[PDB]
């Protein structure tokens, strides 16, 4: 059924998923209690994302032991759009470069952080294609790792090829011609990659992650 | 003149500059120690890293850049572009990589150095996912010049602003010249759009590895890892 979806009712799809925006409540406490609760938002929208639930537990726990870091990065960088220079954790939370060096080390994160905002600004990025990246993030970071072991594999690359239609789809609908609409995919798709570095660098200075079981008992 | 190329002229040029395959230091002793067996892969890195140098200065764009962009870019790339390398030279080795054609191994040989079966066992599965894709030469040249440019274009004025409209201008036109070759070898629109994305996603993967490698070249206390910037460039000049 997920294989089976139009572009339109995809991008509908996860339109609908989209988790909310929440509310902060030392520094790195605000930040903490505010990812643990997009995280518990971010479970359930995974649920949601067509093909998602077509894989076995051990697979999407799998997919969101790898995901969940860069997941919470497109979110904040898609929040902060609108506030160059800033980066807009919570509505009632809004950080600048500056205010990232109350903690060691956080300076050079937060530095990448904005220059990806100022990336999908100068793009122009759209809601519709937002929610088509951070599904394939979701579904891309974890897959490259028996009977079930094959099959899930494809599953999830044939679910792929369909979010890459999509975001064709939504471009040629926009006005893009056919050259355009390949640079452009090119473009939100090499930037995923420099997703997955904020992330390996982020989650190598948070050395505070959620385990194999601690992310099973929230699919349940 | 970069900007001018056309899709064939592009891989020409990045095909004329590929660097060569080279071979592991000769007779070592075997088996390897946790020591021996990174000293000759390490011995073998800074060698492909000098033909490094000179291919990055051939990839259209790049010496139209400062050189403390060329530097920055080689930085943040040059672990993705050895280990791409890597997973090209090891695609019909199935279960082995490929380091040199004197210096093939498997699995089980990773565990020699603590840290290094997981790094591998990422380095295999990416080369069966070459295989399957039945990623063609055009294609992997592609994909090697795209690391160098896109990797570090994202970490650093009129003039910055100038470098990195410049450097996506000829990524763009590299993606041309991805499209064009599928195109040629007769895919249908579609089944372009989808190999241009798998292809590209795999380089999030290749990033990944990247990262992790670097973390475990620093964690065996290897003093010094990594290139530092102050390497590179003097190996730029001239
Ligand atoms: C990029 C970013 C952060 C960020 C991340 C890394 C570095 C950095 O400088 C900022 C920290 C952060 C992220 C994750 C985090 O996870 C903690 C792990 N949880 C505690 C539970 C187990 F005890 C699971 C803590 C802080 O705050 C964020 C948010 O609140 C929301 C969105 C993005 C971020
Ligand atoms: C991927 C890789 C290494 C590798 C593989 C896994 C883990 C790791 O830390 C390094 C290791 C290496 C050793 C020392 C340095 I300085 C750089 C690379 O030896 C290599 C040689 C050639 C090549 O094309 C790739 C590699
Ligand atoms: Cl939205």
Redesign the pocket.
């Known amino acids: 059924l997920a294989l089976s979806l139009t572009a339109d009712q995809m991008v509908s799809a996860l339109l609908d998923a989209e988790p909310p925006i929440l509310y902060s409540e030392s520094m790195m406490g605000l930040?903490?209690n505010?990812?643990?609760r997009?995280?518990v938002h971010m479970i359930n929208w995974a649920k949601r994302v067509p093909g998602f639930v077509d894989l076995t537990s051990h697979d999407q726990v799998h997919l969101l032991e790898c995901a969940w870091?860069e997941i919470?990065?497109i979110?904040?960088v898609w929040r902060s759009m609108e506030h160059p220079g800033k980066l807009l954790?919570a509505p009632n939370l809004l950080l600048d470069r500056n205010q990232g060096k109350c903690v060691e080390g956080?300076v050079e994160?937060?530095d990448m952080?904005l220059a990806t905002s100022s990336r999908f600004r100068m793009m122009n990025l759209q809601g519709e294609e937002f929610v088509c990246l951070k599904s394939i993030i979701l579904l891309n970071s974890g897959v490259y790792t028996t009977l079930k072991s094959l099959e899930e594999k494809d599953h999830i690359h044939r679910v792929l090829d369909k979010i890459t239609d999509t975001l064709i789809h939504l471009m040629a609908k926009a006005g893009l011609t056919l050259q355009q609409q390949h640079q452009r995919l090119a473009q939100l798709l090499l930037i995923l990659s420099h997703i997955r570095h904020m992330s390996n660098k982020?989650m190598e200075?948070?050395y505070?992650?959620?385990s194999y079981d601690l992310l099973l008992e929230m699919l349940d």
């Open positions: 930040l903490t505010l990812a643990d997009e995280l870091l919470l990065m979110g904040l954790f956080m994160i937060f952080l982020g200075h948070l505070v992650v959620p």
